[PDB]
PDB file of C-alpha atoms in Angstrom:
ATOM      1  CA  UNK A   1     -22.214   3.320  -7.182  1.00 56.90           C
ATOM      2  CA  UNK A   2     -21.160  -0.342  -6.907  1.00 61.60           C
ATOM      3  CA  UNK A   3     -17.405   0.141  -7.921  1.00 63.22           C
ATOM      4  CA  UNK A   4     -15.025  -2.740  -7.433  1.00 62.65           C
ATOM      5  CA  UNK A   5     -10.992  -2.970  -7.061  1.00 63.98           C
ATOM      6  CA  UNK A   6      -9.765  -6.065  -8.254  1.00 63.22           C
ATOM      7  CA  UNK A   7      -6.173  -7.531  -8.529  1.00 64.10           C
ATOM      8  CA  UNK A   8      -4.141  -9.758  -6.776  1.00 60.35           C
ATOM      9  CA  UNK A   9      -4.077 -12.335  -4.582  1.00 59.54           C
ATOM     10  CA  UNK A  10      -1.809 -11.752  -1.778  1.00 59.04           C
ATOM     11  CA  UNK A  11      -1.676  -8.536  -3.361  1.00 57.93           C
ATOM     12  CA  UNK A  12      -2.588  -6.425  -0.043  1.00 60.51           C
ATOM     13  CA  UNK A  13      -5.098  -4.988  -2.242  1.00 60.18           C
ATOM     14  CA  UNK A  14      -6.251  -3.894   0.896  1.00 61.08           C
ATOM     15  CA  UNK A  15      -2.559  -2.808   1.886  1.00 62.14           C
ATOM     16  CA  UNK A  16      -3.588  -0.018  -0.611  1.00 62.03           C
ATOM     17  CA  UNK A  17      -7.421   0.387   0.561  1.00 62.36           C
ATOM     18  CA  UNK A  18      -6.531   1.620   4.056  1.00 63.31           C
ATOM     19  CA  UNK A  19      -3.571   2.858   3.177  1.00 63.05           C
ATOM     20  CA  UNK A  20      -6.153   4.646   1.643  1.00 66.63           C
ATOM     21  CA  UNK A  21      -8.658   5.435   4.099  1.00 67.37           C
ATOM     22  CA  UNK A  22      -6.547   5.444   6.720  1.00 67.40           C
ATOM     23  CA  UNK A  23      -3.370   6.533   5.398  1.00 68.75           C
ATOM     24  CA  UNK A  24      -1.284   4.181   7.302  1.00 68.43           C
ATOM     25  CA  UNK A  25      -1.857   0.654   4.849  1.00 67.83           C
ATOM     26  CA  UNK A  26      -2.866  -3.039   5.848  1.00 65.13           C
ATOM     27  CA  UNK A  27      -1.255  -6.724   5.302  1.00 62.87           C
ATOM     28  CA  UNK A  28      -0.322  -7.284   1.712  1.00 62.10           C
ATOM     29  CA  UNK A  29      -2.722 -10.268   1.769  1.00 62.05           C
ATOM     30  CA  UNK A  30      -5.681  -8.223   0.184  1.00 62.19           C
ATOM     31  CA  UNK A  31      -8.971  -9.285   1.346  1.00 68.49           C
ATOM     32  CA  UNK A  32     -10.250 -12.407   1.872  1.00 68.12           C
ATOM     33  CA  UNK A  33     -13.441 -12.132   4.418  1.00 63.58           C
ATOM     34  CA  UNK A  34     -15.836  -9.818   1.886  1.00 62.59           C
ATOM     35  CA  UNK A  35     -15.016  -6.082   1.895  1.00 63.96           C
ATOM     36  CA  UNK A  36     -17.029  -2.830   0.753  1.00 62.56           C
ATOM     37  CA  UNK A  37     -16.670   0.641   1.819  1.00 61.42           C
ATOM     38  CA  UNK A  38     -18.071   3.326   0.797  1.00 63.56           C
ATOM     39  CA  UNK A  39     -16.542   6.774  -0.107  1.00 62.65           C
ATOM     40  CA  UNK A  40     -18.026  10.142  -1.338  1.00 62.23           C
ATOM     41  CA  UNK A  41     -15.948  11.729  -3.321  1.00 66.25           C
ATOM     42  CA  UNK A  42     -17.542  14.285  -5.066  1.00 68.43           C
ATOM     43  CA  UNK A  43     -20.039  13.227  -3.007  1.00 66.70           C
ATOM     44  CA  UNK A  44     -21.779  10.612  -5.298  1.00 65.63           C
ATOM     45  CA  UNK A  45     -20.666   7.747  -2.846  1.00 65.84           C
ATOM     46  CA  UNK A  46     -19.133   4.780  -4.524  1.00 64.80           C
ATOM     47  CA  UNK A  47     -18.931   1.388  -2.335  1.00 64.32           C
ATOM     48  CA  UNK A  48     -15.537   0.995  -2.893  1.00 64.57           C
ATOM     49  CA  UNK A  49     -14.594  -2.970  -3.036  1.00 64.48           C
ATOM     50  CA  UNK A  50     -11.792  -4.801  -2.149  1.00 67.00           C
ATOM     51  CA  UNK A  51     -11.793  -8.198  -3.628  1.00 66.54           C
ATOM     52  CA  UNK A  52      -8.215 -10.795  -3.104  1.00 65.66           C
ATOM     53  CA  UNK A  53      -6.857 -12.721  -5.944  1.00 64.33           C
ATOM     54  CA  UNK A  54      -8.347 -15.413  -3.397  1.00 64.56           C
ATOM     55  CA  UNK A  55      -7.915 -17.610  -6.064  1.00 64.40           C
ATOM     56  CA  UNK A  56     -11.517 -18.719  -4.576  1.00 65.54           C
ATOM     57  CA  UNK A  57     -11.888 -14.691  -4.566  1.00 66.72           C
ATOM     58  CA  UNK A  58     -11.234 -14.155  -8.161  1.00 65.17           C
ATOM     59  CA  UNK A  59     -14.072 -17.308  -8.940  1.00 62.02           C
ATOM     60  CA  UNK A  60     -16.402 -15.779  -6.934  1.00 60.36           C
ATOM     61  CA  UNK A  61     -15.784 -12.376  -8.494  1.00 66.11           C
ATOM     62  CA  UNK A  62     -17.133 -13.513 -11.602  1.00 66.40           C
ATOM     63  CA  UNK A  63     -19.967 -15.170  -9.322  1.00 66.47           C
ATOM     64  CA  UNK A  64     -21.518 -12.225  -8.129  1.00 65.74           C
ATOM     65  CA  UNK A  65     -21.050  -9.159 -10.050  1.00 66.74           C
ATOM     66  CA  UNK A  66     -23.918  -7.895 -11.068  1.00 67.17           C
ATOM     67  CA  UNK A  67     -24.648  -4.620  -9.728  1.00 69.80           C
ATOM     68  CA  UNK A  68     -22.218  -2.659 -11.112  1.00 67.53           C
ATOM     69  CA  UNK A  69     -21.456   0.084 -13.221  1.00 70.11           C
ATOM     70  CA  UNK A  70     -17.600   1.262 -12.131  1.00 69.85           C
ATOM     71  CA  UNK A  71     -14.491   0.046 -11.416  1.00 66.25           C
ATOM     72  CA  UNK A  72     -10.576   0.570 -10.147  1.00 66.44           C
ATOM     73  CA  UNK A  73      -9.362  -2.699 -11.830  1.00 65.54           C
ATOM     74  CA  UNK A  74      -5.892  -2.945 -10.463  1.00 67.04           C
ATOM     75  CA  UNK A  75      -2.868  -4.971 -12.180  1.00 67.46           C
ATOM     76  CA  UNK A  76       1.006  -5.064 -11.629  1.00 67.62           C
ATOM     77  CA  UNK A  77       3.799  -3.500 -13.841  1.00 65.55           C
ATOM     78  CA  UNK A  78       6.366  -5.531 -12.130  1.00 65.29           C
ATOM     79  CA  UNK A  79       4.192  -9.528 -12.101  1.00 67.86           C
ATOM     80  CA  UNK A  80       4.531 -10.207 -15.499  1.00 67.43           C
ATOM     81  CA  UNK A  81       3.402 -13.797 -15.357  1.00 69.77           C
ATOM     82  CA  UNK A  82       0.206 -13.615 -13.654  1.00 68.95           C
ATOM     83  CA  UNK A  83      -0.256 -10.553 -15.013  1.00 65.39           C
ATOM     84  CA  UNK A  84       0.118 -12.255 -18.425  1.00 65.69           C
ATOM     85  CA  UNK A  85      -2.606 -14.951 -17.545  1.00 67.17           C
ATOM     86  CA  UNK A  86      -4.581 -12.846 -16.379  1.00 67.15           C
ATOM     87  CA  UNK A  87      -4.978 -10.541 -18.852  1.00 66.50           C
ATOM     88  CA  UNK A  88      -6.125 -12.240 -21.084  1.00 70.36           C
ATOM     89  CA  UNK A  89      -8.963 -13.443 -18.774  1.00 70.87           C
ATOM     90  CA  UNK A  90      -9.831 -10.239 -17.114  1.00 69.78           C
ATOM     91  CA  UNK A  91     -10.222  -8.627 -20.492  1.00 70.91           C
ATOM     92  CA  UNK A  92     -12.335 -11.050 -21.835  1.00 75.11           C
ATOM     93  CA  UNK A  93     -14.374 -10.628 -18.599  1.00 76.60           C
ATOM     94  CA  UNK A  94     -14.539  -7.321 -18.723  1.00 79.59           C
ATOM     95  CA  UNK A  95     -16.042  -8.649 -21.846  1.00 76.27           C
ATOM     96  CA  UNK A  96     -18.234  -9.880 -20.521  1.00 74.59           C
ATOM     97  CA  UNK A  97     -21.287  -7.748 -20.709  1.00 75.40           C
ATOM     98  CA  UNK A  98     -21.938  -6.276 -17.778  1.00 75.53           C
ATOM     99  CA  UNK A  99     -18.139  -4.911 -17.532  1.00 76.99           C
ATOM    100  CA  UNK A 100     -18.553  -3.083 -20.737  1.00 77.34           C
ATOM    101  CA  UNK A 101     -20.807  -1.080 -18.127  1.00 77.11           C
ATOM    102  CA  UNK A 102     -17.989   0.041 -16.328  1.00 77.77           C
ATOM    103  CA  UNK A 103     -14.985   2.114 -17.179  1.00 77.62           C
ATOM    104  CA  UNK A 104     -11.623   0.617 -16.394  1.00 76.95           C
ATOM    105  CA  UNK A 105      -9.838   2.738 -14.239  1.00 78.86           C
ATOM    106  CA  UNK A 106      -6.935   0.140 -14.387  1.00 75.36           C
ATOM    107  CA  UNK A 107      -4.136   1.043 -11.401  1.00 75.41           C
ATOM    108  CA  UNK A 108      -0.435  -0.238 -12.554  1.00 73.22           C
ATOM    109  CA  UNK A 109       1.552  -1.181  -9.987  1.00 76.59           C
ATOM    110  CA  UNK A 110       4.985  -1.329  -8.679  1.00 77.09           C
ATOM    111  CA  UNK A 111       6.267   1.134 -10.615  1.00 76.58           C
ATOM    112  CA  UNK A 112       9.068   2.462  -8.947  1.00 79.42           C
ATOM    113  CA  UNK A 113      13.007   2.293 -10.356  1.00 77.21           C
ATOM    114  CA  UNK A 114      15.615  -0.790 -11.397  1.00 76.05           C
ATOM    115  CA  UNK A 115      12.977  -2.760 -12.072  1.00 77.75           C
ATOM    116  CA  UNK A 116       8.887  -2.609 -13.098  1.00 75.77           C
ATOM    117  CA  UNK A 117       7.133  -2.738 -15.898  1.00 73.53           C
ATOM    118  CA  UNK A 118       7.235  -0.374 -19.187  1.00 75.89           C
ATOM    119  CA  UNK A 119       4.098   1.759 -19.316  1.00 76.20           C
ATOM    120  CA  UNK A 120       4.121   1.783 -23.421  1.00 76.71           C
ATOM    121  CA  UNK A 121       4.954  -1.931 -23.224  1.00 75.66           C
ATOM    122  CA  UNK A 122       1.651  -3.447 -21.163  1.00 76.07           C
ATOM    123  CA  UNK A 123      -0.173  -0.939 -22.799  1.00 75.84           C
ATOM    124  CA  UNK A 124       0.676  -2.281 -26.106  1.00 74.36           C
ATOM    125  CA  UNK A 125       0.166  -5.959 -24.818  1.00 73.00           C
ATOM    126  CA  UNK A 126      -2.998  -5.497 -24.140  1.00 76.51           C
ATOM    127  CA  UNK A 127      -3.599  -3.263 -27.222  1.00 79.29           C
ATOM    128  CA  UNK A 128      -4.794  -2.506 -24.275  1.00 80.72           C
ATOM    129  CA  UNK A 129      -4.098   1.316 -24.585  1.00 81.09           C
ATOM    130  CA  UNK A 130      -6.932   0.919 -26.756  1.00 81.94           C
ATOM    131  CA  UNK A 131     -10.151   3.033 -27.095  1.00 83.37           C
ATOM    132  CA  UNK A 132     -11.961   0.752 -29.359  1.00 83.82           C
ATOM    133  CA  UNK A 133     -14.686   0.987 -26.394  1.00 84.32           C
ATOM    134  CA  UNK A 134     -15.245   3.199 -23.239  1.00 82.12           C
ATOM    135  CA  UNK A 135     -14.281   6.177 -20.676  1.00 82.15           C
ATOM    136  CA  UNK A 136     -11.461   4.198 -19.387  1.00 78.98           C
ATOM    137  CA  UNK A 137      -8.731   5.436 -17.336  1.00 79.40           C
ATOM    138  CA  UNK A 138      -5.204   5.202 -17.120  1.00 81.29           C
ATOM    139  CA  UNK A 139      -3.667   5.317 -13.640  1.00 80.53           C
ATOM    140  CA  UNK A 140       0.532   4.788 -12.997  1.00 82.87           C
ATOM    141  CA  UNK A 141       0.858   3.896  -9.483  1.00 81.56           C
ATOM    142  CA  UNK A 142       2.823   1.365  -6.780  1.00 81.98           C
ATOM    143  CA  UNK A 143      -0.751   2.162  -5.252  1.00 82.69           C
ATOM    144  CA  UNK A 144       1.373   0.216  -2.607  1.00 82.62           C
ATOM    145  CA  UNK A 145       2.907   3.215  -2.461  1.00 81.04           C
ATOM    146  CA  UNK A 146       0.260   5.258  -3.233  1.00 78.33           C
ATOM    147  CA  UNK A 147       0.874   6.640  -6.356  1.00 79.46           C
ATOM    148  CA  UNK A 148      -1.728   9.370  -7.930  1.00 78.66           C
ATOM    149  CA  UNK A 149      -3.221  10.376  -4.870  1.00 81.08           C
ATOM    150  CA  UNK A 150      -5.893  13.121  -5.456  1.00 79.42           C
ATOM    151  CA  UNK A 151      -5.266  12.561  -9.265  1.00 80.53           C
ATOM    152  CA  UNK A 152      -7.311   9.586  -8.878  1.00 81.55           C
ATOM    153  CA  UNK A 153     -10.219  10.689  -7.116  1.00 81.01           C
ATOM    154  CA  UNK A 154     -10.225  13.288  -9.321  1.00 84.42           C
ATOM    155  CA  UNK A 155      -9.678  12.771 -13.086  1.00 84.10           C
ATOM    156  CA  UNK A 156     -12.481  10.015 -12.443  1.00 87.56           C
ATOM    157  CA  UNK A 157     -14.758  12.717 -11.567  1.00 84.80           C
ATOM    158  CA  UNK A 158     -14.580  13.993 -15.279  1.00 84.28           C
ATOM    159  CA  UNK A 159     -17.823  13.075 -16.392  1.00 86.87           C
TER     160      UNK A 159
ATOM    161  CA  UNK B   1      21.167  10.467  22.619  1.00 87.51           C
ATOM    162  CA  UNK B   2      18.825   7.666  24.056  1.00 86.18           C
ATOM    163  CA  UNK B   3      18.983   4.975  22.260  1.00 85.66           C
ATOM    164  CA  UNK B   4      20.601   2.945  19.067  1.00 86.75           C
ATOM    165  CA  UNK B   5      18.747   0.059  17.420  1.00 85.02           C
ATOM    166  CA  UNK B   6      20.827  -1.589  14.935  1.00 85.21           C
ATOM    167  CA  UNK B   7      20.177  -3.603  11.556  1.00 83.18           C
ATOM    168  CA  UNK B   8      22.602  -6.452  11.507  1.00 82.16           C
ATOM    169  CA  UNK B   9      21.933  -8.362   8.136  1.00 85.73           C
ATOM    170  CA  UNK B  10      22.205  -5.049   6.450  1.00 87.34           C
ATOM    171  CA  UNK B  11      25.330  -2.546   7.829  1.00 86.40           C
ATOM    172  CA  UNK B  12      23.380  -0.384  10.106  1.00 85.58           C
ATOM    173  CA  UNK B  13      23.037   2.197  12.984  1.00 87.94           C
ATOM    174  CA  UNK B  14      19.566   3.467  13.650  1.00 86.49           C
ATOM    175  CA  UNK B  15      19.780   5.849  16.343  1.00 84.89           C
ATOM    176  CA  UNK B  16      17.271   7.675  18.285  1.00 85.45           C
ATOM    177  CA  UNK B  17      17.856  11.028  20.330  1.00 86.31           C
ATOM    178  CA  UNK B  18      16.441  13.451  22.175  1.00 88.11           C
ATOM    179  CA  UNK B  19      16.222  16.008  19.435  1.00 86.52           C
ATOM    180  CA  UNK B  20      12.984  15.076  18.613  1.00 87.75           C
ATOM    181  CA  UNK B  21      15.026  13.107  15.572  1.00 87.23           C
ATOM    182  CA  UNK B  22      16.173   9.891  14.759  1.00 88.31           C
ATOM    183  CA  UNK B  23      19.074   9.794  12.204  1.00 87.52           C
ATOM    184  CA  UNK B  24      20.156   6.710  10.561  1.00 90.39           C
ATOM    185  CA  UNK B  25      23.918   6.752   9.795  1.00 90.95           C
ATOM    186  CA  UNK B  26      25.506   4.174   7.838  1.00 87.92           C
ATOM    187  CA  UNK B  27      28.874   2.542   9.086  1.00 90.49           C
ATOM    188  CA  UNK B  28      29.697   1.413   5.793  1.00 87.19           C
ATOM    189  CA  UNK B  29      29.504   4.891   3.958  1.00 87.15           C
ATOM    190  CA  UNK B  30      31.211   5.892   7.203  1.00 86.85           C
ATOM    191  CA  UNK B  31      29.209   7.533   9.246  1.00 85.40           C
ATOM    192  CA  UNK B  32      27.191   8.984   6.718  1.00 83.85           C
ATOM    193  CA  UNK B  33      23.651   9.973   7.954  1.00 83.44           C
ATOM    194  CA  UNK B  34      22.146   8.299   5.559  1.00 85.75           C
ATOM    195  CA  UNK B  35      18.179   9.222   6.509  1.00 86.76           C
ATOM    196  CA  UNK B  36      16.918  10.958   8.843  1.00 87.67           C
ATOM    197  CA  UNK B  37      13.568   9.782   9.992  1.00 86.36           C
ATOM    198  CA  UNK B  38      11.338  11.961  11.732  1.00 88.21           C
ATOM    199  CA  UNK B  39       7.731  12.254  12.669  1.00 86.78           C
ATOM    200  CA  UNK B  40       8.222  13.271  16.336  1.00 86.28           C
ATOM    201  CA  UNK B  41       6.597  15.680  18.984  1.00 86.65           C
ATOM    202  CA  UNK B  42       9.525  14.882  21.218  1.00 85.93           C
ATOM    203  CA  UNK B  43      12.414  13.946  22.535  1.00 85.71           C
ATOM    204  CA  UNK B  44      13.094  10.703  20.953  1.00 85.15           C
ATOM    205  CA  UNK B  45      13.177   8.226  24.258  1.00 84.16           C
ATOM    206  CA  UNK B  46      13.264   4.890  22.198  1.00 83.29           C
ATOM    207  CA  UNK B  47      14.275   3.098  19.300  1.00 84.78           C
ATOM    208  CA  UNK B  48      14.055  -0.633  19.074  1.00 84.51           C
ATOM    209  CA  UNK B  49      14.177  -2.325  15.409  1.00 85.94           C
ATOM    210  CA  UNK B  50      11.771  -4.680  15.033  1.00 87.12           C
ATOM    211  CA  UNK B  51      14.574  -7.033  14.226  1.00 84.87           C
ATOM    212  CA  UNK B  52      12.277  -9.774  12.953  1.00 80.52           C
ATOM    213  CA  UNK B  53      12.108  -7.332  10.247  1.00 75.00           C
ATOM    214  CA  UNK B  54      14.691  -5.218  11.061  1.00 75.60           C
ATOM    215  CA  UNK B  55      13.952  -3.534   8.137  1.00 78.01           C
ATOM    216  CA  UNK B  56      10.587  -2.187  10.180  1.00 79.42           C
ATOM    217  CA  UNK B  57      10.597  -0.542  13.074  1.00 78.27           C
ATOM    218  CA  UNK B  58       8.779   0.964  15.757  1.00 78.37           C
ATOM    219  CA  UNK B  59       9.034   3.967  18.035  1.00 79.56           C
ATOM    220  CA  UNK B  60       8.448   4.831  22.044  1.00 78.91           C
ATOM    221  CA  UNK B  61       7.648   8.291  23.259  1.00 79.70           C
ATOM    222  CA  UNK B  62       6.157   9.681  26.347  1.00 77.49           C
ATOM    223  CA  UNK B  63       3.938  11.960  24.030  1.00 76.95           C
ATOM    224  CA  UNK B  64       2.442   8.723  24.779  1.00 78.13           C
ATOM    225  CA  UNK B  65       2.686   7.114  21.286  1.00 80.76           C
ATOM    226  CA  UNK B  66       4.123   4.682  18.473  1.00 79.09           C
ATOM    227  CA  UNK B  67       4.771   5.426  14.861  1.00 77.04           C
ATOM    228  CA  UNK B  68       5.668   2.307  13.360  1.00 77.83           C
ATOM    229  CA  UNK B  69       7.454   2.927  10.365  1.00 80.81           C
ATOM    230  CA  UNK B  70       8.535   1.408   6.279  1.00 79.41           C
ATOM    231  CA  UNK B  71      11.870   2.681   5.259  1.00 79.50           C
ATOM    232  CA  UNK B  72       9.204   4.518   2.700  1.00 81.52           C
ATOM    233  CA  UNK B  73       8.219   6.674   5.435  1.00 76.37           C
ATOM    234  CA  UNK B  74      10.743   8.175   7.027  1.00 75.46           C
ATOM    235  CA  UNK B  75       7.967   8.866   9.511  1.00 74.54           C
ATOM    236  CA  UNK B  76       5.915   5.956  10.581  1.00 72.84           C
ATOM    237  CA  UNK B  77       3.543   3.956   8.328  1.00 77.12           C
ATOM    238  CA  UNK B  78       0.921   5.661  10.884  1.00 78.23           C
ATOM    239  CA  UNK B  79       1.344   6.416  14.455  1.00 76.52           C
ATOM    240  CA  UNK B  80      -0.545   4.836  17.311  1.00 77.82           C
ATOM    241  CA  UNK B  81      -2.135   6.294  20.726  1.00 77.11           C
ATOM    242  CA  UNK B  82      -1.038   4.122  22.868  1.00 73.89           C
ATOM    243  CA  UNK B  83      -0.077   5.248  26.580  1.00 75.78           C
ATOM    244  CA  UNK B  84      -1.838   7.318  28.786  1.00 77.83           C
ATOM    245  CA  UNK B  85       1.389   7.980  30.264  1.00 77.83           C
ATOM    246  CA  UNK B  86       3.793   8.276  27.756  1.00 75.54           C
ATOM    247  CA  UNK B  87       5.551   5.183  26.008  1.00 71.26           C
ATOM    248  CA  UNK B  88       8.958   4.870  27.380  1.00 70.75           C
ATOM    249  CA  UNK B  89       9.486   1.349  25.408  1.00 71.11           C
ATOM    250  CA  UNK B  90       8.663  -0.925  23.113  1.00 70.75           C
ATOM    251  CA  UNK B  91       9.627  -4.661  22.711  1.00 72.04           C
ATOM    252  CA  UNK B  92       9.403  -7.320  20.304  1.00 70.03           C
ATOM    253  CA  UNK B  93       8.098 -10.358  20.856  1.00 66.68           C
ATOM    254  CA  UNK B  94      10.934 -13.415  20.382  1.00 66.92           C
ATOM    255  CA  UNK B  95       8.886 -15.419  18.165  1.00 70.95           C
ATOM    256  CA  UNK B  96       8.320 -14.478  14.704  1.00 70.66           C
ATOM    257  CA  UNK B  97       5.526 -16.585  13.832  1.00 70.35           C
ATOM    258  CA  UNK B  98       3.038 -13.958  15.819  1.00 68.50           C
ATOM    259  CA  UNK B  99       3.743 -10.415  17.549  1.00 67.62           C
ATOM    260  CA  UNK B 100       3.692  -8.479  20.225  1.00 66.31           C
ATOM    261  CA  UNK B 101       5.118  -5.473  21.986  1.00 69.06           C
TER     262      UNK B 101
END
């Protein structure tokens, strides 16, 4: 299935993907040149995309879209600024029909010691905890530094 | 005991040695081995800091490879298989706008 990971610009969203396939991570500029893999787990094989905050990235996101059904929608507990402007907009475009398609397995970031962001607290802020809709997911993770490994891959399985 | 890379913005004494181990012991603690990074399959040959970011460094051994390594991995971020020899050293490259060993 067409399942997309989303978040930052400059994030190294990518740092993340192949830190993910390949263990070892990637630039912390996420993509930027178009990016799809695909990955059985569970062996219904998900094409697994990487999309930068390229500013132009996050436009185009909204451009094409359509084809999905899934997806890994990745924020940071520790940005609390574009986080905040963002949220609102990501929500609503997750609003955006086709989105409602798609369970929001949401990765928070950063999360690691003097400093982050409270898990209660953006949860609240976006109401956000909220199951007035859909099989959503909750995921705590620096997925920068990988955190939830297998958890991931497999509390999604659950349906 | 091969070789000692050092930080030098931040207090420190990265050593390398043939144990198959580096340490890192921290001058300011005195001494202290504060980490001990391993990750080998030998005799640790090499150590050079990747000064640029000191904070990020990289490995030579004649095992014939190169973990590169994030403090959060007190093994390498991956490791590399480079030589068909073995990898007696690595080097930075002076510049910091691009790199090379």
């Amino acid at each position: 299935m067409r399942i997309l990971m989303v978040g930052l610009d400059g994030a190294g969203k990518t740092t993340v993907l192949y830190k993910l396939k390949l263990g070892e991570v990637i630039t912390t500029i996420p993509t930027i040149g178009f990016n799809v893999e695909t990955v059985q787990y569970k062996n219904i094989s998900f094409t697994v995309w990487d999309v930068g905050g390229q500013d132009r990235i996050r436009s185009l996101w909204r451009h094409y879209y359509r084809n999905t059904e899934g997806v890994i929608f990745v924020v940071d507990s520790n940005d609390r600024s574009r986080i905040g402007e963002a949220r609102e907009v990501m929500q609503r475009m997750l609003n955006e029909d086709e989105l409602r398609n798609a369970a929001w397995l949401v990765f928070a970031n950063k999360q690691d010691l003097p400093e982050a962001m409270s898990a209660a607290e953006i949860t609240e802020k976006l109401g956000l905890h909220s199951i007035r809709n859909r099989p959503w997911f909750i995921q705590a993770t620096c997925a920068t530094s990988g955190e939830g490994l297998y958890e991931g891959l497999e509390w999604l399985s659950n349906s | 005991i091969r070789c000692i890379a050092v930080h030098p913005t931040q207090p420190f004494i990265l050593t390398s040695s043939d144990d198959m181990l580096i340490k890192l012991w921290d001058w300011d603690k005195k001494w202290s081995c504060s980490q001990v990074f391993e990750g080998h399959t030998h005799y640790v040959m090499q150590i050079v800091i990747n000064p640029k970011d000191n904070n990020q460094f990289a490995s030579a051994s004649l095992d014939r490879t190169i973990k590169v390594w994030q403090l959060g991995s007190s093994s390498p971020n991956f490791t590399l298989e480079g030589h068909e020899k073995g990898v007696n050293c690595i080097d930075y490259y002076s510049g910091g706008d691009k790199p090379y060993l």
